[PDB]
């Protein structure tokens, strides 16, 4: 069945169909384009007219122009063949490496796994990053989230999570570029060819790519997260294996929807968001998950508009997560990287029955002294240091060291630090902090704990500062 | 607010008046750290003018930074140095004020108009510390620096 474009305003395209009317979510194919232009059906307006969001620029469209209905949603290649390849929203290859020879495809729109499909399994995923492993550690097959405002360190962190965890992974990884920098994707493509996880010459590639960056129109950005997700899904189910799924940045899915919301005819909710924010998010987030058939460890970068975590978007995301790493500009401003806020990062598995009583007690202690310090800050800033009890002004000296010891040079941030990248094993992190709380380093200078790996290097750094 | 915010970019010189300043008695109630001019450049107004101005605005900003420590703990808790930046800034705020011929009914002073040189030399001298011994009140509502001096002696 054939339709005709009848209205074009930005990304939104009204199409009329005389006979059979395409159901919501169907992909339509615009006729007379040089590059394939898909319209996804969003609404039935009435009067044999459908409202559609566009997966590309709408420049060049003319009223009366012909539109075919493909008779189904956006289907993409899924399988071994997507590995080492780069896809766009609509499963086209964008790596100039020819066709993607898969046996089967998949709709990017699918029902979420049912409650009976859920797993309760959870065991630590050690990252080698002190603050994550210690205070809010990740679980295998868990939903991790990286909250951060503009330029605080989400992508860097996720790059390090990819370096520290995804090279030494037996299964498959998926990276979805959702509404971020195209420069970062080139960056990531050639860094992975170098590391070997993508290989252009044989079939040993362990990572599939899907990109739809901020240079794309709203529709493209609003679906590209599902495209990535769907590649992830196939690997979970039809092979059963350990899937890593990396998404930078999931916010961009919500922002895209808001970009088109008024043209779709919605009254705006608070802070200018589409009223369907939570559910749009719900039906999407709920596919990103470990099931009984297979395990997805998912890590998601999550933008925090205007640094305000209560922003509808980031605020609605927390609950879809098993571990939250929250990064703070205030903390980045001090040079503490990764700029993780230790009094606002959490993990479901931060529990003694799970990580053991030793790990749990240390962590809780670190937060205790840090929180105690935080509430003394503004107070002694004006009322003078000298008035403090000699046990209080020790918790001042110790917290200030632990803050620094939370900082750590990253392998992927060598260009930013000048320092060599360092990976700290779990036990060494627990031991290092245990020791600071104990008082074993009250004689060591503050700056000794700054931007180092394991506790040894703080001690070594102390001597280099002694002359 | 959109009205004034949009207006700024149409001007070559701004003179931003401040309720808070007017309520302290400083007239004209000019905010010295929010008024700008596109000819505030050493090659247009000469290095001397430029240096004093930047000096006046420097001590005024340092003093503005110190005002929160002041508002809780007051004068006393400041180092000897801060006290000097305070005393000098406050004398500088007062000497920025001027009686206008048009405002003689509200001020109780005959209006004054100060030549540019005299203005420079006045703030210059307050920055070199030449009047550290004078009490603030002498700088309030005068014209040339010499009048401040006369008002100091008049205070006995």
């Amino acid at each position: 069945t054939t339709g005709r474009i009848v209205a074009v305003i930005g990304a939104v395209v009204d199409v009329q169909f005389d006979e059979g009317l395409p159901p919501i979510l169907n992909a339509l194919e615009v006729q007379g384009r040089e590059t394939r232009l898909v319209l996804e059906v969003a609404q039935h307006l009435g009067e044999s007219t459908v409202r559609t969001i566009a997966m590309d620029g709408t420049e060049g469209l003319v009223r009366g122009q012909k539109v075919l209905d493909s008779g189904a949603p956006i289907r993409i290649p899924v399988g071994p063949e997507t590995l080492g390849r780069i896809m766009n929203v609509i499963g086209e290859p964008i790596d100039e490496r020819g066709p993607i020879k898969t046996k089967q495809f998949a709709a990017i729109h699918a029902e979420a796994p049912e409650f009976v499909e859920m797993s309760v399994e959870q065991e630590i995923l050690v990252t080698g990053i002190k603050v994550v492993d210690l205070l809010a550690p990740y679980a295998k097959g868990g939903k991790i989230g990286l909250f951060g405002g503009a330029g605080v360190g989400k992508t860097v962190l996720i790059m390090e999570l990819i370096n520290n965890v995804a090279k030494a992974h037996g299964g498959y990884s998926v990276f979805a570029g959702v509404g971020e920098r195209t420069r970062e994707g080139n960056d990531l493509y050639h860094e992975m060819i170098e590391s070997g996880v993508i290989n252009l010459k044989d079939a040993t590639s362990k990572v599939a790519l899907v990109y739809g960056q901020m240079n794309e129109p709203p529709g493209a950005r609003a679906r590209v997260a599902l495209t990535g997700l769907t590649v992830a899904e196939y690997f979970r189910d039809q092979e059963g294996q350990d899937v890593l799924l990396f998404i930078d940045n999931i916010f961009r899915f919500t922002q895209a929807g808001s970009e088109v919301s008024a043209l779709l005819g919605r009254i705006p909710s608070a802070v200018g968001y589409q009223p369907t924010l939570a559910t749009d998010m719900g039906t999407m987030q709920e596919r990103i998950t470990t099931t009984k058939k297979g395990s997805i460890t998912s890590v998601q970068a999550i933008y925090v508009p205007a640094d305000d975590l209560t922003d509808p978007a980031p605020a609605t995301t927390f609950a879809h997560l098993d571990a939250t790493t929250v990064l703070s500009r205030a903390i980045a401003e001090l040079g503490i990287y990764p700029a993780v806020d230790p009094l606002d990062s959490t993990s479901r598995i931060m529990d003694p029955n799970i990580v053991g009583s030793e790990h749990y007690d240390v962590a809780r202690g670190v937060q205790k002294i840090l929180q105690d310090y935080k509430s003394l800050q503004d107070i002694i800033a004006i009322l003078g240091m000298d008035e403090l009890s000699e046990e209080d002004k020790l918790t001042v000296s110790r917290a200030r060291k632990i803050q620094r010891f939370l900082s750590q040079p990253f392998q992927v941030a060598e260009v930013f630090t000048g320092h060599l990248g360092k990976l700290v094993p779990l036990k060494e992190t627990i031991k290092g902090f245990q020791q600071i709380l104990a008082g074993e380093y009250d004689h060591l200078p503050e700056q000794a704990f700054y931007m180092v790996g394991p506790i040894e290097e703080a001690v070594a750094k102390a001597d280099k500062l002694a002359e | 607010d959109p009205a004034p915010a949009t207006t700024f970019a149409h001007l070559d010189a701004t003179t931003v008046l401040s309720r808070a300043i007017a309520e302290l008695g400083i007239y004209p109630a000019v905010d010295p750290l929010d008024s700008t001019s596109r000819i505030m450049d050493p090659n247009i107004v000469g290095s001397e003018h430029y240096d004093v101005a930047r000096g006046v605005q420097k001590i005024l900003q340092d003093y503005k930074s110190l005002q929160d420590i002041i508002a809780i703990l007051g004068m006393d808790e400041l180092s000897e140095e801060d006290k000097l930046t305070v005393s000098r800034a406050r004398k500088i705020q007062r000497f920025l004020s001027q009686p206008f011929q048009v405002a003689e009914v509200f001020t109780g002073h005959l209006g004054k108009l100060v030549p540019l040189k005299e203005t420079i030399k006045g703030f210059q001298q307050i920055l070199a510390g030449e009047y550290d011994h004078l009490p603030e009140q002498a700088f309030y509502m005068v014209g040339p620096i010499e009048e401040a001096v006369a008002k100091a002696d008049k205070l006995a």
Partner: peptide
């Protein structure tokens, strides 16, 4: 004077007039 500050112009007033006590 003494060790403890936050007593206004106390320590400054004698430092102006200036082995010390306190």
């Amino acid at each position: 004077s003494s060790d403890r500050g936050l007593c206004g112009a106390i320590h400054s007033s004698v430092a102006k007039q200036m082995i010390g006590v306190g």
